[model samples]
Target chain A: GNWRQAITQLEADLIYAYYKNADLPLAQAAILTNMALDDSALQGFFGVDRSDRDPQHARAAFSDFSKLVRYTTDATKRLVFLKDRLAKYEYSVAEYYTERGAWVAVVNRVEGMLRDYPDTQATRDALPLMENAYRQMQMNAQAEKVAKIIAAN
Target chain B: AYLEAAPLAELHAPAGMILPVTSGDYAIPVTN
Candidate 1:
């Protein structure tokens, strides 16, 4: 009786593992598809129309994309495109901080963008903004440093 | 030096394509 129960338990474990393997991708796909359909997520991902955009949503979407990039091997183009979009979203937040004269916040955003998404066009566009933020904060040395970076680019 | 927002159409692209996952020795196809 003990052997019979042990064999049944083993069979149940194997079947559960098989089902989980089959369901994992489908569940992942469903999650991504839902994210794509979400208007707030789309707005955050694309950095469009600041009036209704939520940085929180964009941040979450970017987090999901980052995880997916690490999970997938053949989706380079799609994931890279999404990564660049997140860089643009970061630039948008920097712009918002710049308007409010929040120089520190501006620098923080731009620096994070430069460090995380250096190859994106948004990073290049942010360089001048970063330099301006440093100048506003009277960090002339840092401003000059950024200026040199802009020139080299 | 301004950030140009992406076109709205780009946001509508479906994420349904299957991607190949590489975990150790296995390459499993995972759908979007």
Candidate 2:
């Protein structure tokens, strides 16, 4: 009850916000991070899973979590901790765009993760998605380039 | 009166009313 110990049930309401919106996982993560920020004891535990994987929202949530844990050395750990999850989210969203037949968005999302988080676990995860997206769009040269990058790993 | 007429299966408390101890349960009061 300590975490949800608000006088009137604000926590209950906040959780409902998550349940009602499946598309904005990052936004949802950001909100929960903010709550935990306002109260440090809420750190290291949250109801949201890594499945909510929009690269954009994941980035925002990462920043929000950054602010919350800034006082501790664990900030770096937390930042690195999200790398794979962020990559996984980016991969899924890129696949979503692929299904929608939006190649440019798929390309951009995958590349954006590579550009933003180079040498990260998420970046590694993104390479295959980028390579596949390029291949699907018939960008052969870039596709081969991505394949080499993956092979080099 | 209208709420009392509704089936229990169709009823649920809106967000915030649920207590931390247990889910919010809606009960119909009988008039004395």
Candidate 3:
């Protein structure tokens, strides 16, 4: 239990610490990766993997981010609003992991980006991320497949 | 270092894929 607790707590702490720095987007990215990390934990706990996509928790996180610009037309509000409630957090971390060659993590978050923020620049960027992650995993057929998706856009 | 533990744990090869074994590190299998 403690080992699982260790996994859960560290990610929660990361989200909190980044939020304290006013990095709300980073907090969301960490939240998104919380799922990916649990899947990676398949290597431990004797192949036991956990799902971290608590839909209710995601709803709460979304409400909090939405409040970032609620009742405001301020330019700064618009930016962080677009930045967080819309796209930047997942995109930022997707790019981060892509650079780190942490492909699986990128795969999870980028796919989420496509689903959650489609028609946005972040979604546009996620196509390349998907291709790249597939490429890095030596799944070139899948990579080329995603390339066509990008070209279709 | 415990830091060494994390990379070894998360650096997984995908299904149907095998990571290259570095030189001088042959015949040793990976265990977590």
- Provide the TM-score for each candidate, comma-separated: 0.53, 0.48, 0.40
User: How far in Å is the alpha carbon of A125 misplaced in model 3?
Assistant: 2.0
List the candidate 1 regions with Cα displacement exceeding 4 Å: A1-32, A40-74, B1-32
Report the C-alpha lDDT of model 3 over A25-84, residue by residue, as the tens digit.
Answer: 566675322222212344555853222222344344345534453333333233333333
For model 1, residues B1-32, the per-residue Cα lDDT tens digits are 01243422111112432212222311112456
Superior by TM-score: candidate 1 or candidate 3 = 1
Query: Looking at every candidate separately, what fraction of the true A–B Cα contacts under 8 Å does it contain?
Result: 0.00, 0.00, 0.00
Error of 2 at B10 (Å): 54
Tens digits of per-residue lDDT for model 1, A89-123: 78888888899999999987776765466556776
True lDDT of residue A12, candidate 3: 48
Q: List where candidate 2 sits over 4 angstroms from the true fold.
A: A1-48, A53-71, B1-32
Name the candidate that leads on DockQ: 1
**Reference-based lDDT, residue A36, model 2:** 27
Best by lDDT: 1
Give the per-residue lDDT digits (tens) of candidate 2, residues A37-96: 222223325644444433565566576655565334444444555544555566677778
Pitting candidate 2 against candidate 3, the one with the higher lDDT is 2
- How many clashing residue pairs, candidate 1? 1
Q: How well is candidate 1 docked (DockQ)?
A: 0.03
